[PDB]
Symmetry: C3
Subunit: 27 residues, 3 copies
Amino acid sequence: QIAAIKXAIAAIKQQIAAIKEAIAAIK
Amino acid sequence: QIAAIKXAIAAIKQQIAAIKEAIAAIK
Amino acid sequence: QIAAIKXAIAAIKQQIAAIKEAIAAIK
Ligand SMILES: [Cu+2]
Ligand SMILES: [Cu+2]
Ligand SMILES: [Cu+2]
């Protein structure tokens, strides 16, 4: 369960980076 | 504590999906 | 490990709030 939480957070970090890039390009 | 972490991640997944939709509509 | 997961989630919550503000200003 703890390793699954760590994996989910790792995928979320990746999506956050992509979202910020997209918003940065617009701005 | 572990179940609280799982709940927080579930809410974050939901917000990520809504953010990507909004950015997708703009793009 | 559990406290590290809690810290990572706290930083993610902060980034989500900033992302939603930026998207809200655009919309
Ligand atoms: Cu990786
Ligand atoms: Cu649900
Ligand atoms: Cu703080």
